[PDB]
Amino acid sequence: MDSEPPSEISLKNDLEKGDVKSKTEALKKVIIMILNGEKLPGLLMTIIRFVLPLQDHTIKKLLLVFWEIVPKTTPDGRLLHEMILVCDAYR
Amino acid sequence: MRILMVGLDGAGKTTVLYKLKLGEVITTIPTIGFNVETVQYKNISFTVWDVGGQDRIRSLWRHYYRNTEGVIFVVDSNDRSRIGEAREVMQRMLNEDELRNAAWLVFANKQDLPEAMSAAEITEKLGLHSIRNRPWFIQATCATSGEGLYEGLEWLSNS
After folding, report:
1. Separation of alpha carbons B11 and B73, rounded Å
2. Do residues A27 and A70 touch, judged by C-beta distance below 8 A?
3. DSSP string of chain B?
4. Which of B27, B1, B32, B31 is nearest to B13 (CA)?
5. Where in the cell (chain A)?
6. Cβ separation of A89 and B66 shorter than 8 Å?
7. Is the dihedral of CA B86, B92, B98, B99 positive or negative?
8. Torsion of CA A81, A87, B2, B7, to 10 degrees
9. Which positions in chain A touch B63 (Cβ < 8 Å)?
10. Inter-residue contact B59 to B16 (CB < 8 Å)
11. Considering only CA atoms, which of B159, B54, B96, B72 is closest in space to residue A45?
């Protein structure tokens, strides 16, 4: 997904699927559309839900990636708190 | 079947989960995070998300709401100071659109303790009678003995 700004409905579906690869790919697809500068908050609860505690680095690294380029803007699955869904289980 | 089990810290959520999964009473630590496990009961495989109840984590439950078929809300029946707080958490949880049709099962837990509030008392304090929009049930439990646990899984499976 080079740059496709309407694809956020499919990404939500792909983000949790019971297959780790699909989830990683989805979250990756979100990153590439934001970096170009395209739509991203719809997904947030889905994105945040699988990855949170785990020591399994790749999804964690992917989520960690998305928190330095848009964390502030996206708020469906995060909202505003001191120990946000950016860092609460990332302790 | 997808299940979300929450409640305030120390209610007994992880004790419940690992009693169900291992038939064992484990020595818990506060859960900073979740535990997720699959349990077989009578041809149903329940995937239970036990999400820690301390404040930081409490702020995160909303990410586990979506796709939830049923909600286990664990209450420490012996703690009277925090019952109002439980009531407050649970009431706005009931207002959550992703939790809209999910089956609501309250566990009044630590029923084994001498001064534990009764399930009826708890039902009045949590305002359970006022839920008309979906299925609810309250069950007295003791997670250490295992009492009431499977009666819960039973009720849940009949959603």
Report:
1. 9
2. no
3. -EEEEEESTTSSHHHHHHHHHHSS-------SSEEEEEEEETTEEEEEEEE--SHHHHTTTHHHHTT-SEEEEEEETT-SSSHHHHHHHHHHHTT-GGGTT-EEEEEEE-TTSTTPPPHHHHHHHHTGGG--SS-EEEEE-BTTTTBTHHHHHHHHHT-
4. B31
5. Cytoplasm; Golgi apparatus membrane; Cytoplasmic vesicle, COPI-coated vesicle membrane; Cell membrane
6. no
7. positive
8. -60
9. 45, 48-49, 52, 77, 85
10. no
11. B96
Tell me the shortest Cα–Cα distance from B65 to chain A, in angstroms.
9
Of B23, B30, A81, nearest to B14 (Cα)?
Answer: B30
Interatomic CA distance for residues B127 and B136, integer angstroms: 11
Method: cryo-EM
Q: How far apart are CA B71 and CA B59, in angstroms?
A: 17
Could you tell me the resolution of this structure in angstroms? Answer: 21.0
Amino acid at B57: I
- Known catalytic residues of B are 54
